Amino acid sequence: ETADLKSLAKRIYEAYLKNFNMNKVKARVILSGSNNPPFVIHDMETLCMAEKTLQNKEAEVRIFHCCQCTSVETVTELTEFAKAIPGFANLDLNDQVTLLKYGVYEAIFAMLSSVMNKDGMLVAYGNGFITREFLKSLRKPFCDIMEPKFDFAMKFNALELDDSDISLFVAAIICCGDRPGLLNVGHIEKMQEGIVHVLRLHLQSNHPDDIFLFPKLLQKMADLRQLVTEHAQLVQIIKKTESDAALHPLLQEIYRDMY
Ligand SMILES: CCO[C@@H](Cc1ccc(OCCc2ccc(OS(C)(=O)=O)cc2)cc1)C(=O)O
Ligand code: NA
């Protein structure tokens, strides 16, 4: 109706505020501070320094591993976030895992842009900031992991979305009817339609200065799926060629069902 949309939107936004320890506003308040600045990692010296306060494998592999720790935590938060999206809990458990299974990485990269600026990104729960040049100085193929995400982030951040916009966007990413193997594809479809509808109305209302934001945001979902398959391919390549580089068991299984 009209109160049903406020209801849908509000419940989704509160879930977002509840379940994600880190969000765009909080990351911005840090990249600007002061409330204890973020330790900077721009070289091996500071990297080891930062690790000693935030294994014994090669540097590149230790980072590969920490990025995975971040993903695992985000997958957990996304699951709790999803259970709160109106109608998600009513879905069959198999449909819930299928949705989470096929949509966590799109959601992860959609949200990672929040902690990134053109010079680097926030790590260690906000207490650290790693340099983009440093990530690029890493041995190949490890230096190829983050750079593409920075390319995406700069274009995504150019849209200037705030957390309320992002919470709706992530909800739309998760409640996808295209995911293979869905049981009640019809209900999920109704959810998707309602979420995309309120997202668009919310954008027009939250961003009156850019009436073309909705379409530009939708183009991003497209670039995200692309970024993800490219990411998944690089992770497989690294795990397969680099003997010390391993894949966390949960992430290994998620990657198995995506393709
Ligand atoms: C390379 C593994 O990629 C992850 C996705 C990912 C990628 C990057 C990412 O970036 C988080 C930022 C970060 C950068 C460095 C880091 O290491 S450190 C040693 O500086 O703490 C920790 C987090 C989060 C998830 C996967 O496939 O699950
Ligand atoms: Na249909």
**CATH classification at residue 235:** 1.10.565.10
Type of residue found at 250: L
Task: State both tokens at 7.
Answer: 């209801």
Residue 259 is assigned to a ligand binding site: no
Mutation choice for ligand 1 from 20, 56, 71, 101, CB with most ligand atoms inside 8 A: 71
- Domain carrying residue 13: 1-259
What angle is formed at CA 18 by the lines to CA 87 and CA 181, rounded to 5 degrees?
Answer: 35
Half-sphere exposure of 196 (CA within 13 A, CB side): 15
Alpha carbon distance 102, 258 (integer Å): 6
* Chain centre distance of CA 259: 19
Helix (H) or strand (E) holding 159: none
Residue 64 Cα to ligand 1 middle (Å) = 6
**Of the candidates 148, 9, 20, which has an alpha carbon nearest to the alpha carbon of residue 81?**
20
Detail the DSSP E strand segments found in 98-245.
Answer: 116-117, 120-123, 128-131
Length of the chain: 259
Type of residue found at 239: K
DSSP 232-247: HHHHHHHHHH-TT---
Alpha carbon distance 189, 68 (integer Å): 31
Experimental method: X-ray
Alpha carbon distance 246, 186 (integer Å): 38
Q: Is the CB of 68 under 6 A from ligand 1?
A: yes
Type of residue found at 28: R
Domain total of the chain: 1
Q: Is the CB of 123 under 6 A from ligand 1?
A: yes
What angle is formed at CA 177 by the lines to CA 175 and CA 180, rounded to 5 degrees?
Answer: 115
Given a contact cutoff of 8 angstroms between Cβ atoms, the answer to whether 172 and 86 are in contact is no
